[PDB]
Symmetry: C2
Subunit: 198 residues, 2 copies
């Protein structure tokens, strides 16, 4: 079993000093997955946005600390349910190899609580994708039940054969807010990808 | 407190097929053709993209086991090149999405094996199994299982509803999808089962 390198895999960059403070800019190492043009180039707290947030001691929005380190990565979509999807994408240096079992794990979080008169009750749905090139090899579309204020680990698996059409193509990861309901923000952390010969 | 949700022709046992490895090229009764990219024509032949039922019986040349359930499977074959789109089966149910309920959808997915006079069934196009409410995909297994040539494996899709779910009261649905991500570009499904349990 080999670990595949991912940049900023736990969204620990940038460092954030104040509990529950957050950025509204794409996390370093990641790009914004934006197929429905829901996230603008220039963001504020009020627009659809994504960024990192410090889930530290006494957090108002979770029953636990971050799955890993200080920070999580979050996506918030302001448009009404059904408007489309958005999230994070990262293309990796590793390529798809034959006769290899891939296992992608990501913790997914459901915010709880209240932020100045606003309820974070509800959850938009998530999808975790493993890519080769532009092809989604495997994905977990919203199978886990995630309680308010908790994180749960999503596992995505793909097994390549000797003749896979996508061999030699770059691996990628997408972490997607499905905007299927409100509150329509969610969190991700602790992205891990392993490869093991079959 | 688990309850079975009824599904029409859930094991593709209609129509009856007499001869092992025979198959139909029309949508199976109880089902519709999921066709978001118009890959499957309304009038099919043995030469076109198609779907139907197939008898996976004793002495089958395409599998190392029999059908997961009964005699028959449901198949979807796409003639277009990888990347052209997806297609499959859809069935909208009478049942509706209820609050505080755990839904579990199980479907067996098969990978055909073998050859026939120059035709090769080596390879697999990828699968997705979807649980719907209305037009929304609540949960799906996009191709997570490894399925060996000539075998079936069970896919499990789960969704848990809350008390204020946006889609409460909408009709449940199932889609079984050929992803057309590689060739051979056919695959089989069988033994569709959906249960609901209060949380
Ligand atoms: Ca982290
Ligand atoms: Ca929430
Ligand atoms: Ca059957
Ligand atoms: Ca095959």
């Amino acid at each position: 079993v080999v670990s595949i390198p991912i940049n900023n895999a736990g969204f620990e960059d940038p460092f954030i000093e104040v509990v529950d403070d957050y950025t509204v800019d794409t996390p370093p190492g990641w790009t914004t997955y934006n197929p429905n043009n829901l996230v603008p180039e220039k963001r504020t707290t009020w627009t659809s946005n994504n960024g990192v947030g410090y889930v530290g001691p006494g957090t108002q929005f979770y029953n636990q600390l971050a799955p890993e380190g200080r920070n999580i990565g979050y996506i918030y979509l302001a448009q009404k349910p059904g408007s489309g999807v958005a999230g994070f994408e990262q293309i990796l240096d590793a390529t798809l190899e034959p006769d290899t079992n891939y296992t992608l794990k990501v913790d997914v979080g459901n915010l709880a609580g209240t932020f100045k008169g606003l309820s974070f009750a509800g959850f938009p749905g998530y999808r975790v994708e493993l890519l080769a090139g532009d092809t989604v090899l495997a994905a977990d579309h919203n199978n886990l039940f995630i309680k308010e204020g908790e994180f749960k680990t999503s596992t995505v698996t793909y097994t390549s054969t000797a003749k896979d059409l996508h061999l030699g193509q770059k691996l990628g990861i997408r972490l997607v807010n499905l905007l299927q309901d409100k509150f329509s923000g969610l969190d991700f952390d602790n992205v891990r990808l392993t490869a093991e010969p079959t």
